[PDB]
PDB file of N, CA and C in Angstrom:
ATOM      1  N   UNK A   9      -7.877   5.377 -21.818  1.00 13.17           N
ATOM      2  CA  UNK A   9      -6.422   5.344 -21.832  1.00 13.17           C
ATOM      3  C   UNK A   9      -5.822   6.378 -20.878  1.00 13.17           C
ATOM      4  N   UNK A  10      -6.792   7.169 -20.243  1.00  6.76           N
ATOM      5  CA  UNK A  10      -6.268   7.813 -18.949  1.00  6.76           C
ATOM      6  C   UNK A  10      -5.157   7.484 -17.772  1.00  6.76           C
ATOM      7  N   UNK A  11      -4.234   7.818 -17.331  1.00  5.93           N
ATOM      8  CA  UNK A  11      -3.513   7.730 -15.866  1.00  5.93           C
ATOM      9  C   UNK A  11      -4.340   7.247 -15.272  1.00  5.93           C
ATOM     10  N   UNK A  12      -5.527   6.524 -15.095  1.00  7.03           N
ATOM     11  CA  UNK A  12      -6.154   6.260 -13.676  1.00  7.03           C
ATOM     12  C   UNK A  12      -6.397   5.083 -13.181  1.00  7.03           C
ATOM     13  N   UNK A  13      -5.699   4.927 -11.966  1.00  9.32           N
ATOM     14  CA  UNK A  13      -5.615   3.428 -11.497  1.00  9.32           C
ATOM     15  C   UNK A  13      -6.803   3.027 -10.708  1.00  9.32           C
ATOM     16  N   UNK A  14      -7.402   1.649 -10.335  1.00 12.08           N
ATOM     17  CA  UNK A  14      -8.686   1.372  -9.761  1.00 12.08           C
ATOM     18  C   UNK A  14      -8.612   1.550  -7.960  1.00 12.08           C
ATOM     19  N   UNK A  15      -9.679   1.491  -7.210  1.00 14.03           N
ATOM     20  CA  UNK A  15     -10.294   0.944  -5.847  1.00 14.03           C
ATOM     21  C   UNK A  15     -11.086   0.005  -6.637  1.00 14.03           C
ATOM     22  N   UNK A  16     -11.564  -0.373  -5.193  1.00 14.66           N
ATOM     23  CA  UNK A  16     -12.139  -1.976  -5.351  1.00 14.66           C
ATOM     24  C   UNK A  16     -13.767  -1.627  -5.556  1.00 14.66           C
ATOM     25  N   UNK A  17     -13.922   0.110  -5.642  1.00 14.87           N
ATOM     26  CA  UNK A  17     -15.215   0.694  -6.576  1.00 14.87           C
ATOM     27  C   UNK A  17     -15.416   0.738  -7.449  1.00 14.87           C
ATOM     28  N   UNK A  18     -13.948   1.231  -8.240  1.00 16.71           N
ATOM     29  CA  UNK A  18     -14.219   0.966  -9.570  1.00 16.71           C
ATOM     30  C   UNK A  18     -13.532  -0.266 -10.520  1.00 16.71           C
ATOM     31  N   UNK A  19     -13.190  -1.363  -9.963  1.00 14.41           N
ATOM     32  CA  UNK A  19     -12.697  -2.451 -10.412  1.00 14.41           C
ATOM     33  C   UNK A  19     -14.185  -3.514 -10.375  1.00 14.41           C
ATOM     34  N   UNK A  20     -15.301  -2.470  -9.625  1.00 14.67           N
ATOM     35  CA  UNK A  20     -16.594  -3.580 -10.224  1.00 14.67           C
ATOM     36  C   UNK A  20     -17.062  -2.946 -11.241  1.00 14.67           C
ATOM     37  N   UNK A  21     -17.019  -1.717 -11.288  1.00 14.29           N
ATOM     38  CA  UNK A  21     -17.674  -0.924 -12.691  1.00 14.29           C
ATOM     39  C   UNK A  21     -16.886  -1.003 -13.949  1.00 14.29           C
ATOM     40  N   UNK A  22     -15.543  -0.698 -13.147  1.00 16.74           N
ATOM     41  CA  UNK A  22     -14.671  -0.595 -14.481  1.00 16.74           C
ATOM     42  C   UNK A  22     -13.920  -1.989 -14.527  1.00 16.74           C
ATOM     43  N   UNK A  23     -13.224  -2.387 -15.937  1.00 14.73           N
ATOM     44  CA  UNK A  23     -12.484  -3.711 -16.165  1.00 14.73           C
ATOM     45  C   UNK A  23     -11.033  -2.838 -16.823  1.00 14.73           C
ATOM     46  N   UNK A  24      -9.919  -3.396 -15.783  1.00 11.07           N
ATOM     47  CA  UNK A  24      -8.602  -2.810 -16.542  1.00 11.07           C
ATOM     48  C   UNK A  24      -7.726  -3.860 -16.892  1.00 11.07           C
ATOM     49  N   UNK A  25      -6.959  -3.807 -17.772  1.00  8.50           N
ATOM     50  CA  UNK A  25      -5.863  -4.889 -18.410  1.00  8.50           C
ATOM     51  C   UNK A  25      -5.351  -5.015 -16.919  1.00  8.50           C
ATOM     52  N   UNK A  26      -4.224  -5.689 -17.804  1.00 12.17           N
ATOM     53  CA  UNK A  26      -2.888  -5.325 -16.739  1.00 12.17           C
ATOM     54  C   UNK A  26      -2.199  -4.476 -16.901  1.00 12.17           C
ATOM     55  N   UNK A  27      -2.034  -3.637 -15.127  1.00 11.03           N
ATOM     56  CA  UNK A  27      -0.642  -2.566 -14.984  1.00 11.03           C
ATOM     57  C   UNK A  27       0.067  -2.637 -15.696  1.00 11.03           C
ATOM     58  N   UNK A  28       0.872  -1.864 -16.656  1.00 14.47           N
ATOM     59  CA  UNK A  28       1.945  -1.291 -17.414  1.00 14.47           C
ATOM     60  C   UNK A  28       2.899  -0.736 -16.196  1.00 14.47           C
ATOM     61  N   UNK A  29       2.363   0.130 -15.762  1.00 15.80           N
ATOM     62  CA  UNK A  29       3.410   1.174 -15.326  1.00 15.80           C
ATOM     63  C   UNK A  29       2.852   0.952 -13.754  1.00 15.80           C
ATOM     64  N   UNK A  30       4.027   1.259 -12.488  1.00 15.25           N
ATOM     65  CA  UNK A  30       3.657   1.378 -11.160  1.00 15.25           C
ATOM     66  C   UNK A  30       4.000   2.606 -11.025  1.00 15.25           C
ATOM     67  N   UNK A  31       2.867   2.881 -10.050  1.00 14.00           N
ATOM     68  CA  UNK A  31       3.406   3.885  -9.242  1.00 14.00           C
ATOM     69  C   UNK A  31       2.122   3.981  -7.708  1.00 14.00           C
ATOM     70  N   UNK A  32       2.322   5.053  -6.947  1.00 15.02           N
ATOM     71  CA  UNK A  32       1.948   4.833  -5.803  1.00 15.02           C
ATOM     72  C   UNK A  32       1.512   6.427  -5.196  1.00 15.02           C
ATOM     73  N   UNK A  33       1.456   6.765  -3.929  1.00 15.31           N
ATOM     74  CA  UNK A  33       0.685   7.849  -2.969  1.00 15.31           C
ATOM     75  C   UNK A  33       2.036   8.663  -2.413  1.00 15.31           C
ATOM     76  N   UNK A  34       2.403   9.619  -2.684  1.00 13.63           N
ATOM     77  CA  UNK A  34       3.661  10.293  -2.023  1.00 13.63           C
ATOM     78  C   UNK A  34       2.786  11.615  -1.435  1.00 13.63           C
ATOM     79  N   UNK A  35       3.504  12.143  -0.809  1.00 14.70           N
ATOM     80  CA  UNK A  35       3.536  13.938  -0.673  1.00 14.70           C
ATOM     81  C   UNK A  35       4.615  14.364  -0.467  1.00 14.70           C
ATOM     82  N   UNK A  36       4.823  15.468  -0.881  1.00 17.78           N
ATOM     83  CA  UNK A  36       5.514  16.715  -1.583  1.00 17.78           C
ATOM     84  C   UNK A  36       5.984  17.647  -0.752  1.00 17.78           C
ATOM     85  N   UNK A  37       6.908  17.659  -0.182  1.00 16.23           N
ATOM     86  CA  UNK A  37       7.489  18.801   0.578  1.00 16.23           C
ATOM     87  C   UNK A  37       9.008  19.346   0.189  1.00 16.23           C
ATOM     88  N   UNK A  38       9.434  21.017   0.430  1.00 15.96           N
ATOM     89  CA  UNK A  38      10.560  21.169  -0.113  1.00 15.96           C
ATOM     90  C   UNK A  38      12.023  20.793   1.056  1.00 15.96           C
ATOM     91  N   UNK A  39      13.127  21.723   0.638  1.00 14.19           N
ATOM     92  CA  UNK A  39      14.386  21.838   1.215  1.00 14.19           C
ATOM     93  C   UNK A  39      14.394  22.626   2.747  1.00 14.19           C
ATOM     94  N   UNK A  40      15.434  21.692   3.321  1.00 13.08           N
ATOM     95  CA  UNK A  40      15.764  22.224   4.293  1.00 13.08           C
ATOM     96  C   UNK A  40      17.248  23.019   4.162  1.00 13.08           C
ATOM     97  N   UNK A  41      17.849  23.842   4.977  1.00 16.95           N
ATOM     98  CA  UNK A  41      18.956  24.186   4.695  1.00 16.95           C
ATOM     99  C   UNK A  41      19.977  23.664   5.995  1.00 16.95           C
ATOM    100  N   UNK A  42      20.679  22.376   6.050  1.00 17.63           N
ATOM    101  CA  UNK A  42      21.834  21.968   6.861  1.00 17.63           C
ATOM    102  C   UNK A  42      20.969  21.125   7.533  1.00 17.63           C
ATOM    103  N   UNK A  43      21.669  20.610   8.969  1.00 20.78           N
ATOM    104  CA  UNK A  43      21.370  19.323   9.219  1.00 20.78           C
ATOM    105  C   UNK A  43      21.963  19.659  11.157  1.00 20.78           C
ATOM    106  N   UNK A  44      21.642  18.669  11.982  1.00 20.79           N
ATOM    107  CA  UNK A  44      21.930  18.975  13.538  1.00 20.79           C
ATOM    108  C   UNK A  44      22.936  17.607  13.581  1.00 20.79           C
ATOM    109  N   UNK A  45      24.059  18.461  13.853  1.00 17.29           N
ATOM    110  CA  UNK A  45      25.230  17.550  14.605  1.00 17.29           C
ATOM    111  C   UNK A  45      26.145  18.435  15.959  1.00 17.29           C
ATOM    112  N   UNK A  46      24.952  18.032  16.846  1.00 19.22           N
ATOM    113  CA  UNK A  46      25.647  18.738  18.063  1.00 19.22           C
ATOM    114  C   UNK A  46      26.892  18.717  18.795  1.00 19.22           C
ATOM    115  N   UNK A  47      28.308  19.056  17.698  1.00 16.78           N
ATOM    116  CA  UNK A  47      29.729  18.806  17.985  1.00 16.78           C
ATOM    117  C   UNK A  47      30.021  17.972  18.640  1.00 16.78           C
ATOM    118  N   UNK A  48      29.634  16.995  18.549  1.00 19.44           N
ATOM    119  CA  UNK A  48      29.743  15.530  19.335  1.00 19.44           C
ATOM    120  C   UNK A  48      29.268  14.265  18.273  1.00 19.44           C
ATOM    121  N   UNK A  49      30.419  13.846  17.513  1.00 16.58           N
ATOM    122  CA  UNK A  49      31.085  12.720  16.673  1.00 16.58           C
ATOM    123  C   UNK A  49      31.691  12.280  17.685  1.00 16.58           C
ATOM    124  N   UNK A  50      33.032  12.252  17.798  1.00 17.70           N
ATOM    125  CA  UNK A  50      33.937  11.273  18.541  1.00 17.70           C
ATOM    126  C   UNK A  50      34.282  11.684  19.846  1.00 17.70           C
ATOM    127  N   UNK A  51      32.961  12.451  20.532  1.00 16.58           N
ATOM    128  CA  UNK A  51      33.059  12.784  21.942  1.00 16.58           C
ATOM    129  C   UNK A  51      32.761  11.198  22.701  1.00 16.58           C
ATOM    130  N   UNK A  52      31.983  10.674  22.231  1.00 16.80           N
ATOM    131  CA  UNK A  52      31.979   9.434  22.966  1.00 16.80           C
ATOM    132  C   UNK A  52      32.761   8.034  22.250  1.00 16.80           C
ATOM    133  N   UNK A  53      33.379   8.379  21.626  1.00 15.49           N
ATOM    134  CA  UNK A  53      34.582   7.567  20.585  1.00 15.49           C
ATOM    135  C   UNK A  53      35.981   8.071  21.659  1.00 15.49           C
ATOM    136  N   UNK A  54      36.042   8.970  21.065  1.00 13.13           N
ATOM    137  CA  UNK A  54      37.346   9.447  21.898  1.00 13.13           C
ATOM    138  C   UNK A  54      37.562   9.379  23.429  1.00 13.13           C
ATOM    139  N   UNK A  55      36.025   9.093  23.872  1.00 13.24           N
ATOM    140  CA  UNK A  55      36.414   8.922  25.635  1.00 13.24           C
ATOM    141  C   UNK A  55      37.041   7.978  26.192  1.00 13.24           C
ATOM    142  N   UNK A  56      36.662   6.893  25.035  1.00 13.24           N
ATOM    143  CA  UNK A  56      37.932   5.487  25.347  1.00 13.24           C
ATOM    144  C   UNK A  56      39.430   5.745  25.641  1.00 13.24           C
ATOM    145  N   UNK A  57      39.728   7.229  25.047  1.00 12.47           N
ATOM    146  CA  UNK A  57      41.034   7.099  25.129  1.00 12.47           C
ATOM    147  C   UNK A  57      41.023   8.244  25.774  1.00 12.47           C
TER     148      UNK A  57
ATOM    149  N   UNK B 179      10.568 -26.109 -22.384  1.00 14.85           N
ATOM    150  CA  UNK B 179      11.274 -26.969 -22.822  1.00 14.85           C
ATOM    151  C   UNK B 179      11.371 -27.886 -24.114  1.00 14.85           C
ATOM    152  N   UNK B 180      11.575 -28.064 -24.890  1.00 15.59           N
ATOM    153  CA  UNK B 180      11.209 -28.964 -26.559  1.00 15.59           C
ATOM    154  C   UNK B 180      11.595 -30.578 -25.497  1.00 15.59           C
ATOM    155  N   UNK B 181      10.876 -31.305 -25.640  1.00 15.91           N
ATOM    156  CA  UNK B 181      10.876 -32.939 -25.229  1.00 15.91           C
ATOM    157  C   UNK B 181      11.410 -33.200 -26.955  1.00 15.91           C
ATOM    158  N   UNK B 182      11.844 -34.411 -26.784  1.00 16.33           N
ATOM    159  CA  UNK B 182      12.858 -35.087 -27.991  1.00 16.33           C
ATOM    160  C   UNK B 182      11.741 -36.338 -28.623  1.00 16.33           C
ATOM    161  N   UNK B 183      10.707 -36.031 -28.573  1.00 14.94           N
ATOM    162  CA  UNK B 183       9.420 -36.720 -28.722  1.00 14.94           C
ATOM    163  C   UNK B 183       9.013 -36.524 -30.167  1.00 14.94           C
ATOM    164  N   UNK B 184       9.436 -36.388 -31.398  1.00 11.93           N
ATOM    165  CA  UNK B 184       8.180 -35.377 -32.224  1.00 11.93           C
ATOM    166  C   UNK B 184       7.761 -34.401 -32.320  1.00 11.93           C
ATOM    167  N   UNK B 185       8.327 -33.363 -31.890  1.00 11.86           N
ATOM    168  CA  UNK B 185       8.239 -32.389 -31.792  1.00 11.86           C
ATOM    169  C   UNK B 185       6.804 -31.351 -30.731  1.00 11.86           C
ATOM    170  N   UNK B 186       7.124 -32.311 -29.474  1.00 14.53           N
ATOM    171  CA  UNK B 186       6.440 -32.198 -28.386  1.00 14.53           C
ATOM    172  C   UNK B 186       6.944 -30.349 -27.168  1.00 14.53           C
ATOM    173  N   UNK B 187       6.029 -29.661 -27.197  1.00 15.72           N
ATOM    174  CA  UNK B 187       7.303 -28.792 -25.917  1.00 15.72           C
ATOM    175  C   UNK B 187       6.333 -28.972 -24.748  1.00 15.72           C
ATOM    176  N   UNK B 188       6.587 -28.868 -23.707  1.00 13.42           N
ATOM    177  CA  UNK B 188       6.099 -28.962 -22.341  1.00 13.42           C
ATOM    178  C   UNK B 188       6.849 -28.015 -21.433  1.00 13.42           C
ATOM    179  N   UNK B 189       6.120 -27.626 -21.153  1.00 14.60           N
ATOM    180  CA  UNK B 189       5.977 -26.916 -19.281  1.00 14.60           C
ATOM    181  C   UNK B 189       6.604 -28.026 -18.466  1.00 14.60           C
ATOM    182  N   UNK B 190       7.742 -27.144 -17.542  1.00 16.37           N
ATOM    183  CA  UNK B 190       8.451 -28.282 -16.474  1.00 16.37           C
ATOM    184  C   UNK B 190       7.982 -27.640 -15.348  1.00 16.37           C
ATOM    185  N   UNK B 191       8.269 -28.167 -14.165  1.00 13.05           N
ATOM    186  CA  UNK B 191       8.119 -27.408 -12.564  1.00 13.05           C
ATOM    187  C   UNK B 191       6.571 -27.411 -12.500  1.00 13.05           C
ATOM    188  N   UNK B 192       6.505 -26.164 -11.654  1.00 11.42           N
ATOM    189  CA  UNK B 192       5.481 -25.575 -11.564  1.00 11.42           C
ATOM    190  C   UNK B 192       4.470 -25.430 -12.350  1.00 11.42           C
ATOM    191  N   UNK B 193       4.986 -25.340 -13.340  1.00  8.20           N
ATOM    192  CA  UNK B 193       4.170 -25.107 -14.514  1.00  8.20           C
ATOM    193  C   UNK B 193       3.398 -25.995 -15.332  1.00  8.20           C
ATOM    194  N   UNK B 194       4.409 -26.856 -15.411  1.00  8.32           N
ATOM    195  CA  UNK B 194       4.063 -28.397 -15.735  1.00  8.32           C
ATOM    196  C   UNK B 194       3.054 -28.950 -14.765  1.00  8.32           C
ATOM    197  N   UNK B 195       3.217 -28.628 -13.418  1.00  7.35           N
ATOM    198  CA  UNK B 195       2.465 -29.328 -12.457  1.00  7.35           C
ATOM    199  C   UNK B 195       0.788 -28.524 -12.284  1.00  7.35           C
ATOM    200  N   UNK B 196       0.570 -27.546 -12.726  1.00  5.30           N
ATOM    201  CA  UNK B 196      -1.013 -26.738 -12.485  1.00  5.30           C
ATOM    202  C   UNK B 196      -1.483 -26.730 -14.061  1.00  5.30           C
ATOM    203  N   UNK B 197       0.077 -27.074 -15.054  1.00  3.76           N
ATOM    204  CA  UNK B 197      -1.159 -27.495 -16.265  1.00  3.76           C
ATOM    205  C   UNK B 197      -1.484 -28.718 -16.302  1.00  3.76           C
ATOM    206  N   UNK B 198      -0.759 -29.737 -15.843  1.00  4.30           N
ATOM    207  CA  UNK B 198      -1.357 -31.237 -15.694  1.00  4.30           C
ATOM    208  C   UNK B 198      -2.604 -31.214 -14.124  1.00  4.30           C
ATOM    209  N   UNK B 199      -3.076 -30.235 -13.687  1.00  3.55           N
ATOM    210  CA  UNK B 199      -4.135 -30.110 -12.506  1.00  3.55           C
ATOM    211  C   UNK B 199      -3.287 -30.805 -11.251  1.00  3.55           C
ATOM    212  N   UNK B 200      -1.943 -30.693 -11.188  1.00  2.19           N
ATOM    213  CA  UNK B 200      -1.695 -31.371  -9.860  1.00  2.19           C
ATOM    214  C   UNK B 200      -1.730 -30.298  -8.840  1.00  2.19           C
ATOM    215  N   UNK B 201      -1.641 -28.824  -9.018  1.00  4.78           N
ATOM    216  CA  UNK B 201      -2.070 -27.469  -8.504  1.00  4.78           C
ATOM    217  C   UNK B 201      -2.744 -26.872  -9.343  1.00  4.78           C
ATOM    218  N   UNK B 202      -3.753 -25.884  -7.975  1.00  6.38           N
ATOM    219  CA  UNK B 202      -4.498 -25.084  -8.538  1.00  6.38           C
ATOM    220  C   UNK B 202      -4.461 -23.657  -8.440  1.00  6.38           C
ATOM    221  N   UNK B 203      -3.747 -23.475  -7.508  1.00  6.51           N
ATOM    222  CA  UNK B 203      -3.205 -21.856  -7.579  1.00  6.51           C
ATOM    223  C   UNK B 203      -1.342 -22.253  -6.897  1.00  6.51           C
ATOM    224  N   UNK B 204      -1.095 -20.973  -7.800  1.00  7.90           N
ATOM    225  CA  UNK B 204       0.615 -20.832  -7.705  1.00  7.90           C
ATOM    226  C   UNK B 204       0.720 -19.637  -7.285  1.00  7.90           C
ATOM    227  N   UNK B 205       0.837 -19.943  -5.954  1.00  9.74           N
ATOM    228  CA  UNK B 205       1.327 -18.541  -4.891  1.00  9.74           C
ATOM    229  C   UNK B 205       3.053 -18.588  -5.072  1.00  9.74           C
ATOM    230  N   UNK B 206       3.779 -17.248  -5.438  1.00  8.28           N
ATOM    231  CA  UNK B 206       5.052 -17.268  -5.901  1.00  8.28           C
ATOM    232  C   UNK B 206       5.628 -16.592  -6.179  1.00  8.28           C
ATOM    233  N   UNK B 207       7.045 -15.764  -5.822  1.00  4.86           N
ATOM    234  CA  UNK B 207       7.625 -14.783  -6.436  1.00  4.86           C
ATOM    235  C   UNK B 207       7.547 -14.942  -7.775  1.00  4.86           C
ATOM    236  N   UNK B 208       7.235 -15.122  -8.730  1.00  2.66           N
ATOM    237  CA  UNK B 208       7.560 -15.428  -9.796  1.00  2.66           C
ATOM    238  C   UNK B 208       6.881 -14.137 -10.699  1.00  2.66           C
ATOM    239  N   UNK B 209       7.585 -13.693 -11.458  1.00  4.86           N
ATOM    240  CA  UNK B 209       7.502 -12.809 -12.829  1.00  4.86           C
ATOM    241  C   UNK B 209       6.511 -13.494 -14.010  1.00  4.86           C
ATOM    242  N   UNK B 210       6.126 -12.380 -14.327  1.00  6.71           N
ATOM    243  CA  UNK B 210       5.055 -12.463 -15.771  1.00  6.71           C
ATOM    244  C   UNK B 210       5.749 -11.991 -16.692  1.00  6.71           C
ATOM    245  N   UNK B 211       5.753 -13.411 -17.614  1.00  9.81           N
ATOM    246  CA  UNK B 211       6.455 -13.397 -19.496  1.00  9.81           C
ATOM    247  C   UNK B 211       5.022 -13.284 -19.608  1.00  9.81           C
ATOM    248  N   UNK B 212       5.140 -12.894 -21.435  1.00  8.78           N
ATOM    249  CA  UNK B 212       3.799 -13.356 -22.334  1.00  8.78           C
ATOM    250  C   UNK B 212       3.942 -14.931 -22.487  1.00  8.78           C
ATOM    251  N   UNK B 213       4.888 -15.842 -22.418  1.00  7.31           N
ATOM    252  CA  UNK B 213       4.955 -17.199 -22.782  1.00  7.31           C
ATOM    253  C   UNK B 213       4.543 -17.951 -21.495  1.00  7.31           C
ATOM    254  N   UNK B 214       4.303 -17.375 -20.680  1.00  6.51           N
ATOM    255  CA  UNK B 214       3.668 -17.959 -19.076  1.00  6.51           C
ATOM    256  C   UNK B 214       1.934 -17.609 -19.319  1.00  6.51           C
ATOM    257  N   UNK B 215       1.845 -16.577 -19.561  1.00  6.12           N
ATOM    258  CA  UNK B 215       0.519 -15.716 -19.715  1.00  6.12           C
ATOM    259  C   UNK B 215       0.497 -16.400 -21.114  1.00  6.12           C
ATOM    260  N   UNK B 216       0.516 -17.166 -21.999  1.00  6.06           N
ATOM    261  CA  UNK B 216       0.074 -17.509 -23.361  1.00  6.06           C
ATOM    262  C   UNK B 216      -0.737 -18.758 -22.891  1.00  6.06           C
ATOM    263  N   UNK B 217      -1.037 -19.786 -21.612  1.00  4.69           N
ATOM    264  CA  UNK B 217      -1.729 -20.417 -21.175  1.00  4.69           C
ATOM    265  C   UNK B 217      -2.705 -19.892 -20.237  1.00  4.69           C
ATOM    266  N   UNK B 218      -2.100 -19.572 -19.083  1.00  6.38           N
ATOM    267  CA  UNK B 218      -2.473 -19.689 -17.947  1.00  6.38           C
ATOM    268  C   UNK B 218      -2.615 -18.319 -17.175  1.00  6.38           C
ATOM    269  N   UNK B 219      -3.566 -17.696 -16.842  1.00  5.58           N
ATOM    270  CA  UNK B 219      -4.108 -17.163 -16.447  1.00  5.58           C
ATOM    271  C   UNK B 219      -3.484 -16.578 -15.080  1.00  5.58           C
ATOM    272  N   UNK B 220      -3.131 -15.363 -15.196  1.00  5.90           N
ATOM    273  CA  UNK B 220      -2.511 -14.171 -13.920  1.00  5.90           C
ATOM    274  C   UNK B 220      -3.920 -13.277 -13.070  1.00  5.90           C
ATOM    275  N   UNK B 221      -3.590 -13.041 -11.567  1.00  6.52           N
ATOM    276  CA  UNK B 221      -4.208 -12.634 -11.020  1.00  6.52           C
ATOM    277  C   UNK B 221      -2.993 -11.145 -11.328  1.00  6.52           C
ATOM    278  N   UNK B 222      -3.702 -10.284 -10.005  1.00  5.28           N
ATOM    279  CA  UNK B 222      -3.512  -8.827 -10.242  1.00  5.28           C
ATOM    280  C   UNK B 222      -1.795  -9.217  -9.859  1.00  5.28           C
ATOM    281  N   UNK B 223      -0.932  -8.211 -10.229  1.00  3.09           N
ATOM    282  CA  UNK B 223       0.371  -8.336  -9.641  1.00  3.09           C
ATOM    283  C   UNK B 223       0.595  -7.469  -8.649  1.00  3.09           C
ATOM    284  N   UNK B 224       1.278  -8.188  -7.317  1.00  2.00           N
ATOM    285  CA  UNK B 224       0.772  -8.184  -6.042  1.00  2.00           C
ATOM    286  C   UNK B 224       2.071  -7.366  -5.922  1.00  2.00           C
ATOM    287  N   UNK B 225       3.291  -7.878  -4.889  1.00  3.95           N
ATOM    288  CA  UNK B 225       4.117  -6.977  -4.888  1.00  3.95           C
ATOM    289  C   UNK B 225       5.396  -6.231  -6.175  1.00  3.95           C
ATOM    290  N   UNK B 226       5.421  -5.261  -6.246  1.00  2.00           N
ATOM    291  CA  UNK B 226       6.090  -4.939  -7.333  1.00  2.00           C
ATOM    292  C   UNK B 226       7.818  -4.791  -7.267  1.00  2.00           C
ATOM    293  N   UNK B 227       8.371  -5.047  -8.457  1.00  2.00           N
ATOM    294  CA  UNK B 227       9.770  -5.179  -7.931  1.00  2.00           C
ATOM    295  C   UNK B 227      10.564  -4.664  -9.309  1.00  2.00           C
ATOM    296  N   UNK B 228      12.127  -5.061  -9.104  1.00  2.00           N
ATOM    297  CA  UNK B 228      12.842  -4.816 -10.503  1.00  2.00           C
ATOM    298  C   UNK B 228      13.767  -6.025 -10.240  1.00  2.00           C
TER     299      UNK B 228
END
């Protein structure tokens, strides 16, 4: 009744119901602080006019 | 579906059609009830959704 989902190694050894629950492979990284907007929004908006 | 037969129920569509053998595999978006799975037999569930 472990968390542990199969490969196609242990789906010959081992026999599992069916999935209940999904889930999948992420990694983990933290915060950045702010973001790059090189004062240029409606520099090329505004050149129309 | 309940048919008006005697108290007959039947599988329509798809369903109707791979339990009468007119298909043999049902490739398909289709969702898993227990009343689908109370016949017929599910492979692994392939893409996952809500």
């Amino acid at each position: 009744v472990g968390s542990l989902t199969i490969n196609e190694e242990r789906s010959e050894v081992v026999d599992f119901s069916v999935p209940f629950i999904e889930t999948g492979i992420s990694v983990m990284v933290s915060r950045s602080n702010g973001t790059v907007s090189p004062s240029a929004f409606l520099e090329p908006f505004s050149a129309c006019v | 579906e309940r048919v008006q037969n005697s108290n007959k129920k039947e599988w329509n569509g798809m369903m109707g059609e791979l339990l009468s053998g007119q298909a043999d595999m049902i490739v398909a978006p289709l969702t898993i009830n227990n009343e689908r799975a109370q016949y017929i037999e599910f492979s692994k569930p392939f893409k996952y959704q809500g």
